[PDB]
Amino acid sequence: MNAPPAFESFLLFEGEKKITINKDTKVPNACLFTINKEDHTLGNIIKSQLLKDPQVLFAGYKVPHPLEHKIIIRVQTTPDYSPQEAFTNAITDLISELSLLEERFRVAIKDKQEG
Amino acid sequence: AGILFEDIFDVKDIDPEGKKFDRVSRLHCESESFKMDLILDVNIQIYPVDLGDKFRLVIASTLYEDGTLDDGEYNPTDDRPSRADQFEYVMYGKVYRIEGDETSTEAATRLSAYVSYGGLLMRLQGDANNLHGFEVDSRVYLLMKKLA
Amino acid sequence: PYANQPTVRITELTDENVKFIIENTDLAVANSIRRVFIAEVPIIAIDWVQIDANSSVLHDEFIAHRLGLIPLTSDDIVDKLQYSRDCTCEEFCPECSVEFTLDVRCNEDQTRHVTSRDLISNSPRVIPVTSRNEQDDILIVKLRKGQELRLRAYAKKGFGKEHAKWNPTAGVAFEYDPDNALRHTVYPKPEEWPKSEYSELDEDESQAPYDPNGKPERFYYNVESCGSLRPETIVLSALSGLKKKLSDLQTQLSHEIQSD
Amino acid sequence: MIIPVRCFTCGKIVGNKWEAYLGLLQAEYTEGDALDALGLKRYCCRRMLLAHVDLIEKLLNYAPLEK
Numbered sequence: 001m002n003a004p005p006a007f008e009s010f011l012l013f014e015g016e017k018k019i020t021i022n023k024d025t026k027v028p029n030a031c032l033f034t035i036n037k038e039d040h041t042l043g044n045i046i047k048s049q050l051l052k053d054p055q056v057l058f059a060g061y062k063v064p065h066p067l068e069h070k071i072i073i074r075v076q077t078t079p080d081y082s083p084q085e086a087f088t089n090a091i092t093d094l095i096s097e098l099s100l101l102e103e104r105f106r107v108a109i110k111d112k113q114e115g
Numbered sequence: 116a117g118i119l120f121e122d123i124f125d126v127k128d129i130d131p132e133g134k135k136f137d138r139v140s141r142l143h144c145e146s147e148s149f150k151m152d153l154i155l156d157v158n159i160q161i162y163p164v165d166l167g168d169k170f171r172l173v174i175a176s177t178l179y180e181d182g183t184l185d186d187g188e189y190n191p192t193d194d195r196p197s198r199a200d201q202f203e204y205v206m207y208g209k210v211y212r213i214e215g216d217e218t219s220t221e222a223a224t225r226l227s228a229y230v231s232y233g234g235l236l237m238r239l240q241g242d243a244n245n246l247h248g249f250e251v252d253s254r255v256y257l258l259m260k261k262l263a
Numbered sequence: 264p265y266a267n268q269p270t271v272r273i274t275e276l277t278d279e280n281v282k283f284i285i286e287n288t289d290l291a292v293a294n295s296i297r298r299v300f301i302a303e304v305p306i307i308a309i310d311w312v313q314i315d316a317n318s319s320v321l322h323d324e325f326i327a328h329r330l331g332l333i334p335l336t337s338d339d340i341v342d343k344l345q346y347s348r349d350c351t352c353e354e355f356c357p358e359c360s361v362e363f364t365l366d367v368r369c370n371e372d373q374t375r376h377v378t379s380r381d382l383i384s385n386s387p388r389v390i391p392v393t394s395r396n397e398q399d400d401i402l403i404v405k406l407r408k409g410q411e412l413r414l415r416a417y418a419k420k421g422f423g424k425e426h427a428k429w430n431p432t433a434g435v436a437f438e439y440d441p442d443n444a445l446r447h448t449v450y451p452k453p454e455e456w457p458k459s460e461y462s463e464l465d466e467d468e469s470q471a472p473y474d475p476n477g478k479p480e481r482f483y484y485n486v487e488s489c490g491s492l493r494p495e496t497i498v499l500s501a502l503s504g505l506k507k508k509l510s511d512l513q514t515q516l517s518h519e520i521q522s523d
Numbered sequence: 524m525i526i527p528v529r530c531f532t533c534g535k536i537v538g539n540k541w542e543a544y545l546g547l548l549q550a551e552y553t554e555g556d557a558l559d560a561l562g563l564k565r566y567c568c569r570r571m572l573l574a575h576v577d578l579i580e581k582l583l584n585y586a587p588l589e590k
């Protein structure tokens with residue numbers, strides 16, 4: 001009667017975009033990234049990778065409502081840096097981490113199966 | 116300088132009323148140079164303190180070695196010379212009370228400054244001479260270092 | 264400001280589970296990998312049923328739901344098949360789904376077990392795990408003399424985020440800091456708690472001394488496979504899918520920075 | 524009414540273990556030892572086999588609608 005399809009949590013509706021960037025006028029050099037059809041899986045890793053950047057002053061995320069399927073990521077950086085640049089570098093670092101982890105897991109399987 | 120008070124204290128007792136909180140302990144200490152009593156709540160989990168320990172306590176209005184006010188906002192990406200570098204345990208709080216033995220006609224010979232570091236309470240009481248730097252509703256730092 | 268350099272150490276690898284340790288990574292990365300094991304590793308599962316005849320004592324939705332939960336070998340085929348969202352065909356085609364038939368009738372007196380072995384596929388690579396060449400076959404329904412079940416299923420690509428039938432795992436054990444050194448748990452009575460299998464403590468000592476400067480490193484995983492994929496294939500798919508989500512997010516991010 | 528396919532909790536397949544479980548039980552295994560023989564570690568899967576009531580066996584005592 002009122003059950004949303006299970007694909008709604010991860011599929012995107014037409015005309016609604018994956019990520020939206022919004023100044024935060026609160027404080028300088030802060031942005032809100034509203035990411036649609038993602039959840040804690042990406043929000044947590046992006047936030048923690050951003051917390052590794054010493055030029056990031058604030059990094060946080062929230063799922064505003066569990067029944068809704070978007071996350072907000074707030075990023076504040078130092079004035080010489082940009083929250084968009086910080087977000088990009090965090091994603092790049094996560095990708096490189098996962099590529100390295102994948103290659104090393106392949107090697108570890110390789111070794112386990114043959115010795 | 117920005118230093119309201121500086122002295123060397125000796126831990127005389129820890130939790131006389133018993134352990135109330137697991138990661139926080141109350142030290143009852145007394146100095147030697149000024150004869151000031153101190154009650155201090157410290158996070159013993161990260162900065163353990165044993166009975167009989169001796170430490171230097173510095174109540175300061177600012178961390179910057181040059182006279183410069185603080186904004187009360189957390190700025191980890193700050194490169195100026197901070198006096199927190201010289202110390203091990205640093206807390207930031209506000210003075211919420213100043214008692215004294217004053218009468219309706221006489222001024223206070225002994226004062227008692229109460230500070231709150233985010234709920235960790237301190238009472239520094241002794242001669243009013245040494246507690247002129249304290250106003251109520253004023254932000255201060257702890258700057259405590261253990262010495263042998 | 265840059266990526267971790269995680270290392271991996273696989274301590275057990277069977278057809279049923281993989282037990283490994285990831286070391287020098289962040290807890291968020293470790294938990295996202297754990298979550299992707301469960302929710303974003305695609306496999307093949309029956310997601311469309313047409314009951315042509317069902318005289319059994321279980322109604323049609325019961326049979327359909329039961330067929331959806333049968334694991335299908337998805338090892339090399341899942342990467343090749345498309346989502347039916349992405350396929351440019353009609354309802355079905357061999358590029359986005361796999362056909363199954365089942366047609367059983369109990370003639371004898373004596374109860375006929377319609378099992379996953381009766382699910383006949385058009386694709387030899389995608390078959391029920393129990394049917395793969397020990398463990399018995401998954402029981403779909405018991406039929407009495409005169410009862411009959413004839414149906415036609417289609418299996419599609421999906422992941423556990425849509426339905427648990429596309430979840431390839433049969434339990435993902437995840438642990439870190441087996442000795443409570445970070446004190447992320449606070450035992451009222453630490454002596455009463457059993458030791459972790461990964462604990463490295465003498466029996467007199469209940470938990471490790473508190474580490475003020477530590478964080479979570481060295482996460483222990485035991486990924487058990489339901490059968491559709493190998494466990495190492497589950498882990499490799501999980502890493503690829505998590506990565507590759509991050510790549511899509513990056514692409515959209517670049518467009519959105521561009522457009523401003 | 525019939526053995527579930529997956530464990531409700533973890534998703535381990537238990538639908539191929541009911542018949543083997545009963546065979547082990549008539550072979551004079553204890554229920555715990557039988558569950559151990561089938562590889563059900565976790566008390567969720569042990570719950571699935573140990574608490575199952577095979578009602579379908581009773582539903583098959585009725586003649587079907589068509590001969």
Ligand SMILES: [Zn+2]
Pocket residue numbers: 347350351352353354355356357358359360
């Ligand atoms: Zn197609």
Ligand SMILES: [Zn+2]
Pocket residue numbers: 530531532533534535565567568569
């Ligand atoms: Zn289970």
